[PDB]
Amino acid sequence: LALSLTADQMVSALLDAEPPILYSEYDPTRPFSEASMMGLLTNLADRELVHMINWAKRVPGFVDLTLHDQVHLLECAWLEILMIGLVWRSMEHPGKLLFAPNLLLDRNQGKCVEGMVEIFDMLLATSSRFRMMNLQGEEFVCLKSIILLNSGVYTFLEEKDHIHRVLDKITDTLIHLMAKAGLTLQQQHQRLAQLLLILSHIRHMSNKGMEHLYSMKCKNVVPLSDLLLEMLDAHRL
């Protein structure tokens, strides 16, 4: 059970759960258009989602939930989850976003898609923030798990309590990692807060991205898969 895992066991489970890094279908034989660029991001998301499901199923506590609650949490969090992964992957590529190894873009390329550059800039800045804080992989996996369990939790009592118990275990794990790294007790609470406040900014970015995706759909820029249509539907634009 998730509640009987030690911090070290939680970290090991989450690290082993990590999804693979996928490549985009980038076609370097033609120039980008707004449509073709959006097409790459939605196609990449669509393939990543299948792997996200496999990952979520391995997040301690997630399999205890009903299918409806699992659906709800993923519907809520999917873009946040993609974006935290992006910002993580992009840390050691200052000024660029590593959507995939074959799709490493700077802000002038993001400019190709009308209305995407504000989001692009927020993502770059978030990546820089993680770089400055020297975010560790062990911290990153805790944060991504937090997003999955938290983003949809309030919009569902016993199921909720279980979820809140698992979230508490992840907090414990973060603090453990910080103590392990030699942070003072004060530094531990301060870094915990700094990391969790970044999650508010990731939510912000996801909401702005979701509104942008809805515009792309409603302007017939890109065809969305049936999965992305349903993911988008859940955000009720």
Partner: peptide, 9 residues
């Protein structure tokens, strides 16, 4: 729901 099916696959 596609996601509902994917979670079971």
């Amino acid at each position: 729901k596609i996601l509902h099916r994917l979670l079971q696959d």
